[PDB]
Amino acid sequence: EGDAAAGEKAFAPCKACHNFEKNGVGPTLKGVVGAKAGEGADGYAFSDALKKSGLTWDQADLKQWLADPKKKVPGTKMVFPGISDPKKVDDIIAYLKTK
């Protein structure tokens, strides 16, 4: 299944724009699992694309989102190629749940 420990290690690339305490280039990911996309993050300025996506960050949507952000939400301002290893994606999600 998804392993938080492996996920903490795979989260390295995400650190550049995300943290769990404050907004920076990217919004804070605190409590992002199961939350509505582009609506929280203490008032972070989300793109119109994400905010109007109407998506809910469940495991299914996060899986697609991390594999290829722009294909899931054309026009997002999250500039990241995506994680092509499904197991790695699951690990990252297990990690996010801990936050």
Q: Which residues bind ligand HEC (CB under 6 A)?
A: 13-14, 16-18, 25-27, 29, 32, 37-38, 40-41, 46-47, 49-50, 66, 76-80, 83, 92
Q: What residues contact residue 53 under an 8 Å CB cut-off, 6+ apart?
A: 37, 38, 73
CB of 22 to ligand HEC, least distance (A): 14
CB of 3 to ligand HEC, least distance (A): 15
Cβ-based nearer residue to ligand HEC, 27 or 94: 27
